[PDB]
Design a protein around this ligand. Structure first.
Ligand SMILES: *[C@@H]1O[C@H](CO)[C@@H](O)[C@H](O)[C@H]1NC(C)=O
Lengths: 48, 49
């Protein structure tokens, strides 16, 4: 019973991670933040 | 000269870099191209279109 429950729960975790993109947000935003910062720096080259 | 970076000056706009062929369809009165950093990305030769 424990083995079957563990295997089914691992399958459910696989389904959730393959179907929910926002479950990675807490990482992606970080990159975005950095990118955003970089973009701002680039934009500061347009100021007079 | 192509395939080598040289100090270019097109219509007063000066700089240094390689002048390579482009496939970007520039509309009739396109003269200069600007990137996100406001730097020159493409230029149109005043002699050859
Ligand atoms: C200037 O050069 C372009 C191409 O190099 C040519 O088509 C044009 O006839 C030239 N103009 C004169 C006045 O020679």
């Amino acid at each position: 019973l424990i083995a079957n429950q563990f295997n089914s729960a691992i399958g459910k975790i696989q389904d959730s991670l393959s179907s929910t993109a926002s479950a990675l947000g807490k990482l992606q935003d970080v990159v975005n933040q950095n990118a955003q910062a970089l973009n701002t720096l680039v934009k500061q080259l347009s100021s007079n | 000269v192509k395939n080598k970076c040289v100090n270019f000056n097109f219509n007063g706009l000066t700089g240094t870099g390689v002048l390579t062929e482009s496939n970007k369809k520039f509309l009739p009165f396109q003269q200069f191209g600007r990137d996100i950093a406001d730097t020159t990305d493409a230029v149109r030769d005043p002699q050859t279109l």
